[PDB]
């Protein structure tokens, strides 16, 4: 990703294997999370975006940080080194399994319990683990890099201390009564 991490990673469940751009073609192994493509002009064009590229752009919210890619990527680039330190595995692999485990499987509509499309499983997975890092680095001594790093490794395997895992089982438990 930065001449440091390889892309020899797989996906646990096939439900997201065809919808995640990891190493399928030669255009996804990109040297930077900075690609200026047009990924929102046709439906299902965002799948062609690199996985880390999509994750980086989700760290650009709350107004005062709008349209600042360089500031956003620096947080991610110095976080995947922390994830490797705390897991001794591939940081890309840690992100990939974290998405699968934190992905919701059933939501509700105004209530009727309904399942979630595989893309919305990916889209909501990113929206969850970034919110926890954004809120937990607010008015805190700890930096956003470790804040993002600890959430991914916690939400990776099974930990319920992460914000992503709490919300993933929050909707399923609510949908468990909305059958």
């Amino acid at each position: 990703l930065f001449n440091k991490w390889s892309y020899d990673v797989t996906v646990s469940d096939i439900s997201l294997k065809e919808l995640l751009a990891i190493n399928s073609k030669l255009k996804y192994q990109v040297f930077l999370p900075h690609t200026a493509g047009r990924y929102q002009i046709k439906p299902f064009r965002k799948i062609q975006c690199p996985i880390v590229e999509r994750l980086v752009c989700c760290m650009m919210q709350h107004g005062k940080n709008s349209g600042k890619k360089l500031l956003a990527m620096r947080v991610v680039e110095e976080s995947f080194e922390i994830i490797h330190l705390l897991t001794e595995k591939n940081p890309i692999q840690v992100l990939v399994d974290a998405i699968i485990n934190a992905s919701p499987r059933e939501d509700s509509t105004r209530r009727q319990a309904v399942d979630v499309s595989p893309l919305r499983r990916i889209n909501q997975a990113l929206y969850l683990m970034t919110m926890g890092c954004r809120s937990a680095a607010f008015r805190n001594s700890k930096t956003l890099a470790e804040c993002l790093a600890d959430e991914i490794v916690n939400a990776s395997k099974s930990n319920t201390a992460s914000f992503a895992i709490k919300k993933k089982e929050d909707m399923e438990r609510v949908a468990k009564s909305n059958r």
């Binding site: 620096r74 110095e78 080194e81 922390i82 330190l85 930096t143 890099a145």
Partner: peptide, 10 residues
């Protein structure tokens, strides 16, 4: 690991 002007991670 890296020591830039933004973080000191070791």
């Amino acid at each position: 690991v890296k020591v830039d002007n933004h973080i000191w991670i070791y």
